[PDB]
From a paper:
RIG-I is an essential innate immune receptor that responds to infection by RNA viruses. The RIG-I signaling cascade is mediated by a series of post-translational modifications, the most important of which is ubiquitination of the RIG-I Caspase Recruitment Domains (CARDs) by E3 ligase Riplet. Riplet is a homodimer composed of an N-terminal RING domain (catalytic domain), CC domain (coiled-coil domain, homodimerization), and C-terminal PrySpry domain (RIG-I recognition domain). Each structure contains two RIG-I molecules, one p3dsRNA24, and one Riplet homodimer, but they differ in the relative positions of two PrySpry domains, which depend on the relative positions of their partner RIG-I molecules.
Given that the footprint of RIG-I on dsRNA is ~10 bp, we designed a 24-basepaired dsRNA (p3dsRNA24) bearing two 5′-triphosphorylated blunt dsRNA termini for recruiting two RIG-I molecules. Indeed, p3dsRNA24 successfully forms a stable ternary complex, resulting in a significantly enhanced Riplet KD (from 700 nM to 6.6 nM), enabling large-scale purification of the complex for subsequent structural work. In the structure reconstructed from the major population of particles (70.1%), each triphosphorylated terminus is bound to an individual RIG-I molecule (end-bound complex), thereby enabling the Riplet proteins to adopt a head-to-head arrangement. In this case, each PrySpry domain recognizes a specific motif on the outer surface of RIG-I Hel2. Despite the different relative orientations of PrySpry in the three structures, the PrySpry domain uses the same interface with RIG-I Hel2 in each case. Using the major particle class as an example, the interacting interface buries a comparatively small solvent-accessible surface area (889.5 Å2 on average, 1200–1700 Å2 for antigen-antibody complex), consistent with the low affinity between Riplet and apo-RIG-I/RIG-I:p3SLR14 (0.7 µM). At this interface, the Riplet PrySpry domain uses several loops to recognize a rigid motif composed of an α-helix in the outer surface of the RIG-I Hel2 domain. The side chains of W415, Y417, and L419 in PrySpry insert into the hydrophobic pockets formed by F616, I617 and L624, while R342 and E350 in PrySpry make polar contacts with RIG-I Hel2, resulting in an interface that is consistent with the first RIG-I:Riplet structures obtained using artificially fused RipletPrySpry-RIG-IΔCARDs 23. Single point mutations in Riplet, including F616A, I617A, and L624A in RIG-I and W415A, Y417A, and L419D, which are located at the RIG-I:Riplet interface, drastically diminished the IFN response in the context of RNA ligand p3SLR14. This finding confirms that Riplet interacts with RIG-I:p3SLR14 under physiological conditions in the same way as that illustrated by the structural work using p3dsRNA24.
Numbering used by the authors:
A (entry chain A): 241 to 662, 690 to 699, 706 to 718, 722 to 923
B (entry chain B), D (entry chain D): 252 to 362, 364 to 430
C (entry chain C): 241 to 658, 691 to 699, 710 to 718, 736 to 793, 800 to 921
The structure:
RNA sequence: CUACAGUCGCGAAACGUACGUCC
RNA sequence: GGACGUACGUUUCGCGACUGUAGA
C-alpha cells in the first residue's frame, strides 16, 4: 500500500517510455514495481485515448494471484480488469474483450493462437506489454512467438503505435556460456529478442535490498555409496536370465544396438533397452502369425528389463525395502490385467527369489549410506532449533514416495510430518514459500528461486547430498556462472544508450535472416495407402485413408471398422483443452495385449478416438517396409481434414 | 584447582565414539572432520555427535573439568550406560544436562523445559555428590555459582556424556586439568 | 626343423597361388610357416625362371631376426640372401641388389622412396610379396603406400605379371566398430586394400594351438585415489602464486584459453598451458626492447607452470619422492643455464618450501594407494612359489624411471631384480600398470576398466566375423572387394608466394634470418646458407648421434644470446660441408609490410619461397 | 572334540586387522572382498592377508579348532606377538606353521623349507603344550595323527596368527566349536 | 622429417529417458 | 491428445593439443 525507495529506482526508466528488463530478487517486489508502471501509464494519457496494458502470466497460479491484486487496486480509479484463461477462452468472443477492457491479464498461449487465426491481427491495439518472468524468451517459447510478430512489424515497414516490451524478471541468466564474451552475447541476444535498451538494477539502494535477498550458505556434503551391495547381485541374476531368454528368438540381439558395455542400474542401460525394443518392432516375417508371437514376446522381455533396471536406481538412492515394493507393484498389475505363457514364466521366476530379496531388505546393516547421513543432518538441526521448517527436492517422482514411507516408520525421525507435493515439518517436493529456513538438495542439480513472499531471510542452509563428483563440481561452477552474470550486467550498464539501440538492431536483422532462411515447406505427401499396425501385438487397426485431422494437431479415425477395434476405460484425471472433453481412454481390444493406443474425447457433439503415433507402426502395403515415427508432423502423408457433414 | 581435589579426569573411549569424530591419541580432544569415516556397526554407535565415557564412579567422590570453548553450541551432562543410542541426550527417561540451544538460551533439562538467563559459561565444571544426589554447575570464579540443581537416582553407572554441533567442521572440545 | 600339421594347414591356401591373410598368435609358429611357402614357391619354378620373393619387415630387430633364420635355412639350396636397411642403402644401387639376389628383406620405407625417384618402375619384377604384420595397412602406412602403386597397376589396364600379396599377421583387428555389421566392413576393407580373398585360419587342428597360446586370465583391481593430498596443497599454492605474479606482465591473460575452470594435476591443465604460451608470442609492440623482456618473462612463467603440472601427474600415479626429483632436476638445470631477475624470483620461492616438501615426502602416511596394492600383489604371488617372474608395462618414460626408485628403495620388497621384474615399456604374472598364468590391471578410474572390457568384446566379435567370411563363395569375394577398390580410387585421385618474411625466436623475439635465405634440401629439411645467420647461433654436441641415409647429426644448435638457450634446430653434414637445418616450430614468422605474426607447427603448413639447394 | 577340552574359541581384534578383511560381528571369520577397507596407518597394520588374536597364552592348556575348507590355499600356525609387521608368516626366526602352497604341497617352515607330501587336512586342529614344547596337528578323524613335530621357546606373548589367499574372491575361513 | 597408436579438451548435429508448464 | 522448456545420458562428424612408439 506504500512504495519505498528501492521500489522506485527500478521503475524509474520504465516510466520514461522505454523497454526494461527489471530484475528484482523479491517475490512481492515484482508485483509492486509493476503496479507503479501500470498506474503511471494510464494517468499520463489525455481525454479520448485509453490504455490497453496487458500482463502476461506464464502459469495459472501466477495468473490467479495477479488477478486479485490488479482488481483490488485498480477499482477506485474506475478501470475494468478481466482475465482470459484456458478454461475461459471458450464461450466468449475474443475480439470484444480486448476492445472493452484495459487491464487484461490473459495468458500468452491464447494470443499466439489468435494471431494465426486472424483475430487481433496486429499488436498495435495494445499500448503496454508486461512480460512477467521474461527470461524464458530464448527459443520457440510462447513469449517468443509474440515477439516474432512484433519484430516483423517494426523491421517490416508497417510500424504503427508499437507498445513497450517491459519485463519484470528475477534472474537474467547466462545459459551454457563458458567465458564472459559468450555471457555478454547472451544478454544482448535476450535484449534483441525483447527489443530492450535499458536494464534496471538496484545499485543506489543496496541497503534495503539486503533485508530481503534470501541468500543462504553452501553446505556441500559428498558421501560414498554402499560397499556390500547384495540387493544388486540377486536382481542382476534375474536380468541375465531374461536377457538370455530373449536371445532364444533373436540371435542378432547384440547387433540391433550400438551402445557399449552396460552396467545394470545405470542410465546407459536404459537407453539400450529402448533401442533394442524399437528394433524388434520392424520385423518382417512373412508368416503374419508367428510375427505376432515373436514381437509380443520380445515386448514383454524388454518391459521386464525396463522395470528391473528402474528398480536398481531406487535401491541406489532410496532405501532397499522400497525397491522391492516397486517390483511387487509392477507384478501385481501385470497379473490382474492378463496372463499368458510368457508373463507366467517371468512371474514365477521372480517369486522363487522373493524370500531371498525380502531377507536382505530387512537387514539393519544394509542401510543406504545416503539415507544414513540424511537422518543425521535431520536430527542435528531439530535438536539445535526444533521449530524449523525444511524442504526436500527430489528429481524422480518414483523416489518421492519412497522417502515419504522412510520417515513414516522411523523411530529417529518421529517428529517430521510428510509434505509431499508431487502441520508439515518437512516438504518433499519435485520442483518449485520463503518460510522454510533449510534447503536440502537430495541429488537434484539456475538455482532454486525461493523468492515468493515479502518476509525475511533469517539464515538458511543449502546442503547438497550426492554420491558422485559430477553434482559436486556442477554447483561449484554455477557460482562462477552467477558471479560473471553480475559483471556482464554492470559492464552493459556503463555503455551509451544511442549505440546500444543500434547494436541490438543488427541482431534483430540477423536473427530474422535465419528465420527467413529456415522456411523449408513440407515434402510431397505419399499418395499410397499404408496401414497402421499395433506396437505390442502388430494387429491391423486401421488404414491411412480413414484418418481425419481435427485442428492440425489431433488425428482421429473416421471409419466404423475401427470402432470395434478398441475398448473403453475411464481416465483417472480428466481435463479440457479448448475444444475437447476427456471422457475415456482407448486400449487394444486383444486377448492379453492391453496396449495404450490413445484417448477418447468429445469435440462438438460426437466422440472421436484420437490416437497417437507413438503406439503404432507404419507398414506400406506395396513394398512391406515398416517404420517407427515418434511425432505426427514427421509422418508425411495425405492429411484429409475432418468434415462433420459425413457422420 | 582451588578446593579439595576429589576425583581424576575421565578419558574418551573409542567403543562409543560415532563415525563422524576423529578424537586423537590423548583421548581428551574430540574434533569434527570434513569426511566421515567408516567404522563398525554395533549397538553402541550413537549415529549422532554424542560421546560417552568408561570411567567407573565411586561412592561420593566425583568431580571433573571439561572446556566447551571454541564451540558454537554444546551440551554437557550425565547419562547412563543402559540407554538406547538412537535417542537424544537430554530427552531420555533420566538424563539431566545443560544444553546451549540455537536460540542463544542456556537451557536445562530434567527428565523439565526450564531455561536459565543469557549467560555463557566458558569453562564449566560439574560437581557431583552421589551419596545424597547433589549436582551443581560451579563453572568459574562467580563465588561458586551453581544456578541449577538436579536430583539423580544413582543405581546405575553414570559416565559423563558430551554433545557438540557436528555439522560445523573445525569445532573441538578439550578436557583439561581439575 | 619339424613342421607340424597345424603349420601345414595355414600354408595350404598359400601354395595354391592366391593372397592369404594367415594369422598366428605365437612367435615360433609365425616364422616357420613363412619358410614353407618360400621354399615351395621357389621349388615349383621351372628352368629359366627365377623368383623375387620379398619380405617387408617393419622394425630393425624384426629385420635382424628374420635375416639370420632365412640365411641359415636357404643356404644348402644355393640362394642369395641379403638385407637392405636404412644404414645400408646409402650410395648403393637398388637395381643391382634386386637383380643379383632373390631373398631380399628390404625395408618398405626405402621402396616408397625408390618408387618416386624412378628406380623399380613397376611391381611386376617381384613374384611373392610377404607383408609382415599386415594389419597396419589401414591409412598412410608404408605398407599402404606400396599398395597405392599395386592397385594403380591392376586397375590401370596394363596389369601384367602381378605378384602375390600374401600377408602375415598376428591379429586381424576390429578398430572402431561396435556391431557385427560394422566389424564385418573393417575386415573386407583390409582384404580390399591387400587384394585378397581367402583368410586362412586353423579349423581342423585346434588341439595343437591350445598347448602354446600364452593366454592368461584377467583380474580387475580398481581402487580409489588418495584424499589427504598434502603435497598437492603446497604445490597448487605455489602455482596460484606464480599465476598471480604473471598477470602483472599481461593484463588480458585469463581470456586467452577459455575452456573451463581448470583443475590442477590433470591433463586438462596441460592443454591450458600450451594455449596461453602461444598467445604471448603474437604480441607486437613498436618499441622492440620492452617486447623482448615481456615475452621472455611470460615464457619462463608458462614453462614453470608446465613443469609444476608435469610433476603433479607423477605424484598421483607414482611415489611422492620421485615428484620432488623431477622438480629438482628442472631447477638445477636452469641454475647453470642462466640467471636473471625472473628466474631468481621463482628459484628462491622454490627453496623456501623445499624443506616443507621434504618433510611431508618422507612420512609414509601421505602415500599414493596405487603403490599399496601393487606391493600387496607382489608379495602374495612370490609367497606361494618362487617361479613367478613378472613383466611390467609402463606407458610414460618418466613413470618407469620413478618405479626404479621403489623396487630397491623400499624395505618390504627385497626379492626383486630391477632379472626378476621387467620394465619393458613396449613388448606368467603380468601386471598392467596403467597400460591399455594370470593377469592384472591396476587403475584409479573406471575408464580403464571399461576400455579393457570392450576389448574382450572386440575379440569375441572378431572371431565370429572371420568364420562368416569363410563360408562365402570365392567368386563373390573377389567381386565384393572390386567395388571397394574402385570406390577408394575415386577419393584418392581427387600455390606459392612472392613476399619476403623474417623469422624470429619464440621466447627471445630476436631477428634470426629472412625467408629469402632458407633453402630446400630434399623437400623435408630447411637450412640457411647466409652469413648473418652463422653468428646468430651457437653449437652444442648431440647426446645421441645418428644418421638417416644422407646426413650426420653431429651437433645441436642453440640461440646465441645471454640466457636464452632456445632449441632452434640441429647441425648436419650433408655432402662435404655443414648446414644449420632448423625447424619452423620453435620460430615466429613476421611480415615486413603487414607486420602481423603467425605460428606454424609444420613446414608443410607454411607456404613460402621454396628455393632448392645449390652446391655453388 | 572327544578328549578333555582345555581352551576356548579365539576372537579377532580390530587393532591388528588387515586392510582387506571384512570380519563380521562374531569376530571369528576372515573374508577377503573385492574392495579394501580404509583403516588407520600405524605400526600395528600388517599390510598383508594376515590377522592376529586377543587370547594371551597360559602354562599348558591351549587347543582350538578352525575350518580350512572352501579355500584354494591357506596357512594356519602360531607366531609371536613381537614380530615385524612387514614380514609374511613363515619367515620369522621363531614361527611354527604349515603352508598349503600353490604347488599342492603341504609345506612347513621352521626357520628351512620342510617340504612334506600331498596330504590335505580339511578342518585342522592345533595342539599346543607350552610347558614342554609339544606341537602336533590332529586335524579330523585320522585316529589322532600328528604328522608334524615342533619345539617352541615359549617365553613371549604367543597370540595365534592366520593367513589366507587374498587374491581370490570368495576365500573365507570360519572358526567352529571344539 | 614422415607415419602409427593412445589419452584429454574445444564445437556442430541427431536421438533417448526423466521432470515441469500451457492449450 | 498436442505444443514448449529444463536436466541427465548416449550415438556420430569435424578440429586442436600433449604423450608414447616406429622408420627414413
Ligand atoms: Zn495389440
Ligand atoms: Zn632467442
Amino acid at each position: 500500500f506504500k512504495p519505498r525507495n528501492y521500489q522506485l529506482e527500478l521503475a524509474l526508466p520504465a516510466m520514461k517510455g522505454k523497454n526494461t528488463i527489471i530484475c528484482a530478487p523479491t517475490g512481492c517486489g515484482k508485483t509492486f514495481v509493476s503496479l507503479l508502471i501500470c498506474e503511471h501509464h494510464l494517468k499520463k494519457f489525455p481525454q479520448g485515448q485509453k490504455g490497453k496494458v496487458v500482463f502476461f502470466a506464464n502459469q495459472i497460479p501466477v495468473y490467479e494471484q495477479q488477478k486479485s491484486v490488479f482488481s483490488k487496486y485498480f477499482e477506485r480509479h474506475g478501470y475494468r480488469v478481466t482475465g482470459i484463461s484456458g478454461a475461459t477462452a471458450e464461450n466468449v468472443p475474443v475480439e470484444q474483450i480486448v476492445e472493452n477492457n484495459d487491464i487484461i491479464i490473459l495468458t500468452p498461449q491464447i494470443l499466439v493462437n489468435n494471431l494465426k487465426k486472424g483475430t487481433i491481427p496486429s499488436l498495435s491495439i495494445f499500448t503496454l506489454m508486461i512480460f512477467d518472468e521474461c527470461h524464458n524468451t530464448s527459443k520457440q517459447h510462447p513469449y517468443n512467438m509474440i515477439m516474432f510478430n512484433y519484430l516483423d512489424q517494426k523491421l517490416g515497414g508497417s510500424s504503427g503505435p508499437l507498445p513497450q516490451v517491459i519485463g519484470l524478471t528475477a534472474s537474467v541468466g547466462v545459459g551454457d556460456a563458458k567465458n564472459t564474451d559468450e555471457a555478454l552475447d547472451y544478454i544482448c541476444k535476450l535484449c534483441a529478442s525483447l527489443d530492450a535498451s535499458v536494464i534496471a538494477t538496484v545499485k543506489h539502494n543496496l541497503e534495503e535490498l539486503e533485508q530481503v535477498v534470501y541468500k543462504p550458505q553452501k553446505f556441500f556434503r559428498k558421501v560414498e555409496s554402499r560397499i556390500s551391495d547384495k540387493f544388486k547381485y540377486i536382481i542382476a541374476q534375474l536380468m541375465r536370465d531374461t536377457e538370455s531368454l530373449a536371445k532364444r528368438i533373436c540371435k542378432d540381439l547384440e547387433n540391433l544396438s550400438q551402445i557399449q558395455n552396460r552396467e545394470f542400474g545405470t542410465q546407459k542401460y536404459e537407453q539400450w533397452i529402448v533401442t533394442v525394443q524399437k528394433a524388434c518392432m520392424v520385423f518382417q516375417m512373412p508368416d503374419k502369425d508367428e510375427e505376432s508371437r515373436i514381437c509380443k514376446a520380445l515386448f514383454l522381455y524388454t518391459s521386464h528389463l525396463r522395470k528391473y533396471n528402474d528398480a536398481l536406481i531406487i535401491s541406489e538412492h532410496a532405501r532397499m525395502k522400497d525397491a522391492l515394493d516397486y517390483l511387487k507393484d509392477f507384478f501385481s498389475n501385470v497379473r490382474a490385467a492378463g496372463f499368458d505363457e510368457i508373463e507366467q514364466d517371468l512371474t514365477q521366476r521372480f517369486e522363487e527369489k522373493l524370500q531371498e530379496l525380502e531377507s536382505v531388505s530387512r537387514d539393519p546393516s544394509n542401510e543406504n549410506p545416503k539415507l544414513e547421513d540424511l537422518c543425521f543432518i535431520l536430527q542435528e538441526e531439530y535438536h539445535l532449533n526444533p521449530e524449523t521448517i525444511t524442504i526436500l527436492f527430489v528429481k524422480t517422482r518414483a523416489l518421492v514416495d519412497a522417502l515419504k514411507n522412510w520417515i513414516e516408520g522411523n523411530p529417529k525421525l518421529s517428529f517430521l510430518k510428510p509434505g509431499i507435493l508431487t502441520d508439515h515439518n518437512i516438504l518433499i517436493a519435485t520442483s518449485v514459500i520463503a518460510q522454510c529456513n533449510l534447503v536440502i538438495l537430495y541429488e537434484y542439480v539456475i538455482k532454486m528461486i525461493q523468492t515468493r513472499g515479502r518476509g525475511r531471510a533469517r539464515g538458511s542452509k543449502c546442503f547438497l547430498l550426492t554420491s558422485n563428483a559430477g553434482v559436486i563440481e556442477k554447483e561449484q561452477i554455477n557460482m562462477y556462472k552467477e558471479k560473471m552474470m553480475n559483471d556482464s550486467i554492470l559492464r552493459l550498464q556503463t555503455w551509451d544508450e544511442a549505440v546500444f539501440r543500434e547494436k541490438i538492431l543488427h541482431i534483430q536483422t540477423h536473427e530474422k535472416f535465419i528465420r527467413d532462411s529456415q522456411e523449408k515447406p513440407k515434402p510431397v505427401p505419399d499418395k499410397e495407402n499404408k496401414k497402421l499396425l499395433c506396437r505390442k501385438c502388430k494387429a491391423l487397426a486401421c488404414y491411412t485413408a480413414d484418418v481425419r485431422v481435427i485442428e492440425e494437431c489431433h488425428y482421429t479415425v473416421l471409419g466404423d471398422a475401427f470402432k470395434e477395434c478398441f475398448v473403453s476405460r475411464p481416465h483417472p484425471k480428466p481435463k479440457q483443452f479448448s475444444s475437447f472433453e476427456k471422457r475415456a481412454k482407448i486400449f487394444c481390444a486383444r486377448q492379453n495385449c492391453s496396449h495404450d493406443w490413445g484417448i477418447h474425447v468429445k469435440y462438438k457433439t460426437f466422440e472421436i478416438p484420437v490416437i497417437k503415433i507413438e503406439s503404432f507402426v507404419v507398414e506400406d502395403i506395396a513394398t512391406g517396409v515398416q517404420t517407427l515415427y515418434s511425432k505426427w508432423k514427421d509422418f508425411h502423408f495425405e492429411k484429409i481434414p475432418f468434415d462433420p457433414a459425413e457422420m | 584447582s582451588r578446593f579439595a581435589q576429589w576425583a581424576i579426569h575421565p578419558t574418551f573411549n573409542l567403543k562409543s565414539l560415532s563415525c563422524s569424530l576423529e578424537v586423537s591419541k590423548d583421548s581428551r580432544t574430540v574434533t569434527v572432520s570434513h569426511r566421515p569415516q567408516p567404522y563398525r556397526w554395533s549397538c553402541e554407535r550413537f549415529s549422532t555427535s554424542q560421546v560417552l565415557c568408561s570411567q567407573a564412579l565411586s561412592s561420593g567422590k566425583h568431580y571433573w573439568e571439561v572446556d566447551t570453548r571454541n564451540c558454537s553450541h554444546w551440551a554437557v551432562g550425565v547419562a547412563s550406560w543402559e540407554m538406547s543410542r538412537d535417542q537424544v541426550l537430554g530427552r531420555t527417561m533420566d538424563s539431566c544436562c545443560v544444553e546451549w540451544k540455537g536460540t542463544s538460551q542456556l537451557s536445562a533439562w530434567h527428565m523439565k523445559e526450564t531455561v536459565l538467563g543469557s549467560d555463557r559459561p566458558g569453562v564449566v565444571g560439574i560437581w557431583l555428590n552421589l551419596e545424597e544426589g547433589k549436582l551443581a554447575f560451579y563453572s568459574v570464579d562467580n563465588q561458586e555459582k551453581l544456578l541449577y540443581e538436579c536430583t539423580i537416582s544413582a543405581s546405575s553407572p553414570l559416565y559423563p556424556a558430551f554433545w557438540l554441533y557436528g555439522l560445523h567442521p573445525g569445532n573441538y572440545l578439550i578436557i583439561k586439568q581439575v
